Ligand binder design. Structure first.
Ligand code: GDP
Ligand code: ADP
Lengths: 176, 369
């Protein structure tokens, strides 16, 4: 093969899933959390394990990135700790929530190319990828995760933003 | 080992209640006495969490506080009423002592200025009767006030195993000087910081000073000279904190020489330069020491509570503390010539005269014999 492996990173409100394109399942899954003392930054399971001595942050609590400084740390963690690869050496496919603000899409792009120096990247809507996985390009996806749920109508591969609905009721609420 | 605290009179309850608030917030303990999620050895002062307090009107305002889930004026009047409830309050102590793993001492917080002062003098004697092998440290607070002050002094000089003096005249001057208050609930903020800082090396274990006798065995040279004074500077290098503690403006006390000094540095300071500073402080000769026996200065580090920067506390044994007794002594004589036996006042007046006589003779090259 001439091409290096491409990375697939699913940014979840509660859990991030990361791995290599072509694989049947993610190689790693970890909590979307970053913690600092009440090693300076803790990310993923370690932040959770040592939460007793840390102040936890959830940078993508409801599917949308709210703190880019900590989101950058989650991505750093993803590449160097979880996947053990150098991002500048692999194309990266990232996922985003439905109705993700345009400015956020540009921010993610700028960070990948300027901060991680990715050779290539792409961003796809989560619901659309799930529909693809089912072997379809048209249909409506009900995506219910940890911090948010969405109903996303998709036609011919394109999500229909005007018909997308967000429900602030998901796994977290059910646990409580 | 554990240490049971007692709180007598209006002052003891207030400064003890503020001591426990500060000590609860210093740890991870909610006002409901339940541990919050959020290393610090807390078994000495907390019981599995329950404080090992014995409180003795003010109790109601404590029970109406958010911390409810955490549990006349003569000296003779304060002494007799303790005799009639002698059996009562000890049952609380007897169960707490035997319920304790291995008791070590008895912290007493009280003001010697009057029912609480009288009750204190009574309890200090009985503890010598029952428990002979338990230290009794008293966080007494100085102010018919001259009468009551010297009587309790007669007991504090032969019963209490250690004593830390805190006089209101030095604390009140600080509040007006560096705090500009012009209240009791305001100066107690400073008293709580000194008390909480005094037992810092007990709750955060280190290589040394893991027991109450470890701090006292160095300062007090003989069982008679068991009076101490305090110093708290931040109201940063370690050389800065030492030099600010040895200034007279910071001490909480209104020739003479030092007997022993203990320094508590609670910051995140560099622990490699601590041995350097003690080399240079000796050269400037900022303090004069006893000529008869050898004496030195002691510095001990610790760690501040992360759940809540450099601070410092200095426990010293200065013979200039004899002056405070002199004021009470002289104030007594003036009232004695102005107005069943009145013989106890005579013995108390006599025994404190020997204590003062020890200090003035403790500064001579022949204090031996
Ligand atoms: N340092 C300090 N001393 C206090 C405080 N409250 C009261 N005192 C002292 O307690 C004395 C009054 O005692 P009092 O409460 O009348 O005795 P009781 O009526 O027998 O409880 C005064 O002389 C004060 O110096 C306080 O908050 N801090
Ligand atoms: N078998 C299950 N039954 C019910 N809830 C589940 C199950 N497995 C996982 N969950 C819940 O699903 C949520 C995580 O799903 P996920 O789609 O990964 O969310 P996100 O992408 O937002 O982090 C959590 O609330 C978790 O408790």
């Amino acid at each position: 093969d001439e091409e290096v492996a491409a990375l697939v990173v699913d940014n979840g409100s509660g859990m991030c899933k990361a791995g290599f394109a072509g694989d049947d399942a993610p190689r790693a899954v970890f909590p979307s959390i970053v913690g600092r003392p009440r090693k300076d930054s803790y990310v993923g399971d370690e932040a959770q394990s040592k939460r007793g001595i840390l102040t936890l942050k959830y940078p993508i609590e409801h599917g949308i990135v709210t703190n880019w400084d900590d989101m950058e740390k989650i991505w750093h963690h993803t590449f160097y700790n979880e996947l053990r690869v150098a991002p500048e050496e692999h194309p990266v496919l990232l996922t985003e929530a439905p109705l993700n603000p345009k400015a956020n899409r540009e921010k993610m792009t700028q960070i990948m190319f300027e901060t991680f120096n990715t050779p290539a990247m792409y961003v796809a809507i989560q619901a659309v990828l799930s529909l693809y996985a089912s072997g379809r390009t048209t249909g409506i996806v009900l995506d219910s995760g940890d911090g948010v749920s969405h109903t996303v109508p998709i036609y011919e591969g394109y999500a229909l933003p005007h018909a997308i609905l967000r429900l602030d009721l998901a796994g977290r609420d059910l646990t409580d | 080992r554990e240490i049971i605290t007692l709180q007598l009179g209006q002052c003891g309850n207030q400064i003890g209640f503020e001591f426990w608030k500060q000590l609860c917030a210093e740890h991870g303990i909610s006002p409901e006495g339940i541990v919050e999620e959020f290393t610090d050895r807390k078994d000495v002062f907390f019981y599995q969490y329950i404080p090992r307090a014995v409180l003795l009107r003010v109790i109601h305002s404590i029970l109406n506080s958010p911390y409810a889930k955490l549990y006349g004026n003569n000296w003779a009047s304060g002494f007799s009423q303790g005799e009639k409830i002698h059996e009562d309050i000890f049952d609380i102590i007897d169960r707490e002592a035997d319920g304790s793993d291995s008791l070590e001492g008895f912290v007493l917080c009280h003001s010697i200025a009057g029912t609480g002062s009288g009750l204190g003098s009574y309890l200090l004697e009985r503890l010598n009767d029952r428990y002979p092998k338990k230290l009794v440290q008293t966080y007494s607070v100085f102010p018919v006030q001259p009468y009551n002050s010297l009587l309790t002094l007669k007991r504090l000089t032969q019963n209490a195993d250690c004593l830390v003096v805190l006089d209101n005249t030095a604390l009140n001057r600080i509040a007006t000087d560096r705090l500009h208050i012009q209240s009791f609930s305001q100066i107690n903020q400073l008293v709580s910081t000194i008390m909480s800082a005094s037992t810092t090396t007990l709750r955060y274990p280190g290589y040394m000073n893991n027991d109450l006798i470890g701090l006292i065995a160095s300062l007090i040279p003989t069982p008679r000279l068991h009076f101490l004074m305090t110093g708290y500077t931040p109201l940063t290098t370690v050389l800065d904190v030492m030099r600010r503690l040895l200034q007279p403006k910071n001490v909480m006390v209104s020739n003479h020489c030092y007997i022993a000094i203990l320094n508590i540095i609670q910051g995140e300071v560099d622990p490699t330069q601590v041995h350097k500073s003690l080399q240079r402080i000796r050269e400037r000769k900022l303090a004069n020491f006893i000529p008869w026996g050898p004496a030195s200065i002691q510095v001990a580090l610790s760690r501040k509570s992360p759940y809540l920067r450099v601070s410092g506390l200095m426990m010293a044994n200065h013979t200039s503390i004899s002056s405070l007794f002199e004021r009470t002594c002289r104030q007594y004589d003036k009232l004695r010539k102005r107005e069943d036996n009145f013989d106890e006042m005579d013995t108390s007046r006599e025994i404190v005269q020997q204590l003062i006589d020890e200090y003035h003779a403790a500064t001579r090259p022949d204090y031996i014999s």
